[PDB]
Amino acid sequence: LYPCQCGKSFTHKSQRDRHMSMHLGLRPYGCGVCGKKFKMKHHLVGHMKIHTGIKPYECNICAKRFMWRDSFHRHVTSC
DNA sequence: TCACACATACACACT
DNA sequence: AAGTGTGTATGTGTG
Ligand SMILES: [Zn+2]
Ligand SMILES: [Zn+2]
Ligand SMILES: [Zn+2]
């Protein structure tokens, strides 16, 4: 078992390390276009969509691609 | 081979 | 309306 700087003892090393990296504020994944640094890969992956303009999540009726999952979920809820 | 174990991506939920 | 954090299912690695 792997203790952390919060009292949470994680089962797996990797989860402790992810948690600690968040604690420190380390941001190893930076954008090579704008210059913002993110602490996790998928954060930077999602952010890249604004540089690359990829607009996924096509609405099933209204035909409105959205960049972000929550925006698409709200539009599907409303429309 | 293969049975298992841990890392990592990705959905999903927040701020 | 994009950044931040968590939980978990593959995928890869290994003995
Ligand atoms: Zn911690
Ligand atoms: Zn960027
Ligand atoms: Zn619609």
What chain A holds in terms of domains, given with CATH numbers, is: 28-78 (3.30.160.60)
**Token pair recorded at residue A72:** 């698409």
**Token pair recorded at residue A73:** 């979920």
Which of residues 3-62 of A have CB within 7 Å of strand B?
A: 11-15, 18, 40-42, 45
Q: A46 CB contacts (<8 Å, ≥6 apart)?
A: A68
Q: How far apart are CA A21 and CA A6, in angstroms?
A: 12
**Does residue A74 approach strand B to less than 7 Å at its CB?**
no
Cα dihedral A28, A33, A36, A42 sign: negative
Ligand 2 centroid distance, CA of A25 (Å): 18
Q: Tell me, what amino acid is at A65? A: R
**Token pair recorded at residue A9:** 């003892």
Q: What's the CA–C1' distance between A1 and C3, in Å?
A: 31
Determination technique for this entry: X-ray
Q: How far apart are CA A55 and CA A29, in angstroms?
A: 22
Resolution rounded to one decimal, in angstroms: 3.0
List, as one string, the DSSP characters of A5-53: TTS--BSSHHHHHHHHHHHHT---EE-SSS--EESSHHHHHHHHHHHH-
Torsion of CA A65, A71, A74, A79, to 10 degrees: -30
